[PDB]
Amino acid sequence: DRPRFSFSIAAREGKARTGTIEMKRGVIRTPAFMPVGTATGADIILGNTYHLMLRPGAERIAKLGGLHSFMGWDRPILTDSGGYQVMSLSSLTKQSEEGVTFKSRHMLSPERSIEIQHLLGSDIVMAFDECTPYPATPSRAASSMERSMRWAKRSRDAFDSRKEQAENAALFGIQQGSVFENLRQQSADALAEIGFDGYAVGGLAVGEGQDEMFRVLDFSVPMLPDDKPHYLMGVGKPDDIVGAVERGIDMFDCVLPTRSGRNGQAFTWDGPINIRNARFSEDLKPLDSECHCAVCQKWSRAYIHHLIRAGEILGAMLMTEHNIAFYQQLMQKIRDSISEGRFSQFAQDFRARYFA
Amino acid sequence: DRPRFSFSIAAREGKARTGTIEMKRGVIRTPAFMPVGTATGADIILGNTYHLMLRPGAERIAKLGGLHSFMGWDRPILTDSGGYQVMSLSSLTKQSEEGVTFKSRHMLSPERSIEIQHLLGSDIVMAFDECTPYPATPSRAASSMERSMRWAKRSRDAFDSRKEQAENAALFGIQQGSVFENLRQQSADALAEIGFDGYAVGGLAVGEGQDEMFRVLDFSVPMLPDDKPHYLMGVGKPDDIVGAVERGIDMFDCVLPTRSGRNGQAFTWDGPINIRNARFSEDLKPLDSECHCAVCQKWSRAYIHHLIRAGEILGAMLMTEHNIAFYQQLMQKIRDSISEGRFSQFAQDFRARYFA
Ligand SMILES: CNc1nc2c(CCc3ccc(C(F)(F)F)cc3)c3[nH]c(N)nc(=O)c3cc2[nH]1
Ligand SMILES: CNc1nc2c(CCc3ccc(C(F)(F)F)cc3)c3[nH]c(N)nc(=O)c3cc2[nH]1
Ligand SMILES: [Zn+2]
Ligand SMILES: [Zn+2]
Incomplete structure (x- = not known):
C-alpha cells in the first residue's frame, strides 16, 4: 500500500529533476x-x-x-x-x-x-x-x-x-x-x-x-x-x-490548454495556431504532424476549422482533447530527456522550433 | 461485395416492418x-x-x-x-x-x-x-x-x-x-x-x-x-x-438529440428532463436508470447539472452522447420487438411510462 506522501528523485540534469510522488490514490510522475x-x-x-x-x-x-x-x-x-x-x-x-x-x-x-x-x-x-x-x-x-x-x-x-x-x-x-x-x-x-x-x-x-x-x-x-x-x-x-x-x-x-481549446487556439511543436484563420480551411494535415492523440490520428485542420467556424461543440471538444494530449506529450518528453541526460539539448531544440 | 442498394424486410407486425438496407459502404438496420x-x-x-x-x-x-x-x-x-x-x-x-x-x-x-x-x-x-x-x-x-x-x-x-x-x-x-x-x-x-x-x-x-x-x-x-x-x-x-x-x-x-444536448434537455424512458433544474443538484442517479451508455455508467445527474450550470463544454458533450445513445437504444428495442412479434405491446408500455 502506498504511503500518504513520498517524493523520490530518480535523475537530475543541472537544476532540473525527474521523479515520483507516491500518495494513497496514485503515483504522480x-x-x-x-x-x-x-x-x-x-x-x-x-x-x-x-x-x-x-x-x-x-x-x-x-x-x-x-x-x-x-x-x-x-x-x-x-x-x-x-x-x-x-x-x-x-x-x-x-x-x-x-x-x-x-x-x-x-x-x-x-x-x-x-x-x-x-x-x-x-x-x-x-x-x-x-x-x-x-x-x-x-x-x-x-x-x-x-x-x-x-x-x-x-x-x-x-x-x-x-x-x-x-x-x-x-x-x-x-x-x-x-x-x-x-x-x-x-x-x-x-x-x-x-x-x-x-x-x-x-x-x-x-x-x-x-x-x-x-x-x-x-x-x-x-x-x-x-x-x-x-x-x-x-x-x-x-x-x-x-x-x-x-x-x-x-x-x-x-488552465491554458482548456481555455485555448474553447477559443480556437491549438498548441503544436511549431508554436500555437489559430484554427479559425482561413489559411486552415483547405489544410488536410492534422493539428500537429507528430502528435499521437486520437484527434490527430483521425481528423484534419480543415475539418476542425469547419466545426469551430460553424459553432459546433464537437470542434471545441476536439481542440481541447488535442491540447491536453500535447501537454502530456510535452511533460513526457521532459521527463525522458532529464532521465537520459539530454534535457539541455531538448530545451534548445524545443525553443528553436516553437519560435521559428 | 455489397450491392449499390438492396432493401430486405425480415419481419412485420401490423404496418410495422424491420429489415436492412445494403449499400456499398455498409448495412443500415x-x-x-x-x-x-x-x-x-x-x-x-x-x-x-x-x-x-x-x-x-x-x-x-x-x-x-x-x-x-x-x-x-x-x-x-x-x-x-x-x-x-x-x-x-x-x-x-x-x-x-x-x-x-x-x-x-x-x-x-x-x-x-x-x-x-x-x-x-x-x-x-x-x-x-x-x-x-x-x-x-x-x-x-x-x-x-x-x-x-x-x-x-x-x-x-x-x-x-x-x-x-x-x-x-x-x-x-x-x-x-x-x-x-x-x-x-x-x-x-x-x-x-x-x-x-x-x-x-x-x-x-x-x-x-x-x-x-x-x-x-x-x-x-x-x-x-x-x-x-x-x-x-x-x-x-x-x-x-x-x-x-x-x-x-x-x-x-x-436533430433533436443534439439540439437538446446543447440546451439542457436529456431523454429518458420516463420522459425528457431539464438537467439545469435545481431538483437535480443533489441527484446521484445517472441520467437514465436503465441506459447502458458510457455517461450513465460513470456520472451522476448532479455532476452533469453542475457542469452545465457552470457553462462547461464537457457538460453539453456528455448530455449529447447520452441523448444519441438513448435514440439508438430506442431504435434497437423497436427492431427487436417487431422481430419478436411484441411491438404492439412495446408501444403501449413505452407510452405508459414516457408520459406517466
Ligand atoms: C494566473 N496566475 C497565477 N495564478 C495563481 C494562483 C492560482 C492557481 C490556481 C487556482 C485555481 C485553479 C482552478 F482553475 F483549478 F480553479 C487553477 C490554478 C495562485 N494561488 C495561490 N494560492 N497563491 C498564489 O500566489 C498564486 C499565484 C498565481 N498566479
Ligand atoms: C423540421 N421539420 C421538417 N424538416 C423537413 C425537411 C428537412 C430534413 C433535414 C434537412 C437537413 C438536416 C440537417 F441538419 F442535417 F442538415 C436534417 C433534416 C424536409 N426536407 C425536404 N427535402 N422536403 C420536405 O418536405 C421536408 C420536410 C421537413 N419537415
Ligand atoms: Zn493531437
Ligand atoms: Zn445514458
Missing part, C-alpha cells in the same frame, strides 16, 4: 502538468475551490460523497486555497488579519480554507496565502509576506487538527515576497521552520513577464528544500514550463 | 435513426447540404476528397436536397419553375441540387422538392405538389446522367400533397411512375401537430411501394418515432 478536472494521461487534476464553495457549497459536496465520487475521478486531486480567486474575481473584498470577507457575503480564513478543502476531499491541500499584487514596493511586499507566513502556520495547525486529513492528504506551503530576494529568503525560512510536504512558488504569473519571472526563479527555487516537490503556481505556456523545469520546478497547473 | 454527422451505433449519418454549399462550398468539399474523407466517416451518408433549409433560413428568396434563387445570391435547381450532392459524395441523395407551407389550401397544395413532381423527374434525369452517382449512390423521391388524401395519392403515383430507390413522406412536421400528422400518415404511407424504404422527414420526438413506425415508416432524421 514529475515534472507534472495538472489540468482542470472539468476539462501518459494526467496523474492528478485540479479542483476549483472558489467555484465549488459557492456552487453547490463544500458541505453539499461532502454530502454527495466528496469530489472524487462527484466527478468520477479516483486518483489524486489538488485544490488551491481560494484567496487568489477571491481577490481576482469577487466584486467587493475586505481584508484583515483574520482572513478575507467578500461578496450573500462570506469570510475565508486559514481555518475555513482548510476545512473547505477537507470537505471536498482533496489529496494535495494548499495553505491559505495572499498573492501580493504586482508591482509591489519592498515595504508592502514584506508586510504581505509576513501575513502570509502567519497564515501558513494557522493552515498547518488547522490541517493537523483533522485526523482524516492529516493521515490521508498532504499540505503544501506557499512562498511569497514579490520579486525581492531577501523577502523570498525570509519566506522560505519561515515555511521550512513550520514544515510542509511540498513547497509552492507563489506571487508570480501576475503581470511581471517571463524575463522577470525567470530572474526571480533563479534565486527563489534554491531556497526551498531540495528533497521536496516544487510547484510554480499559475504557469503556463509551454516555453514557461520548459524554462521553469530548467530552474528546478516539478509541478505546473495548466 | 431499419427502423433507423440518422443523426447529424457533426454531433448499435448509427449506421448512417446526415450531411448538411445547405451549410456545406455555403461554407466551404461543394466544389471545395470535392477538392478536399468528398464528405466521407472530410469528416472521417467511411459509412453511408444521407444528404437533403437543400430547398427546405433555403426556404426556412435564407433572408430573401425568389421562386420559379427553374428553381429557387436566394441570398452573394444563388440559384438552387433540381440539376444543381443533384450536382452538389454528387460533389459532396453522399450515398443517399434526396430529390429536389418544395415543402409546401402549412396550412395550405387545396389549390395551392396541388400546384405546389405538381411542381415538385416535375422537379422529381428532373432530379431523376440529373442523377442518372452522372455515372459515378448512378452506379454508387441511391436516389429517394419525396411525396408532397399537404394533408389531402387525393393529392398524396397523385404524388405517390407520379413518383412510382418515375421510379426511385426509396420514398420519403415530405411536407409534415411543419406545424400540424401529432394528431394531424398521424392522420395523414394513416392514408399516405400505404400509397408508397411496400417493397421500398419509407423515410419520414423532419421527425422527431421519441413518441413520434414510435407512432410513425406503427404506420409503416422505416427511417428518421433526428
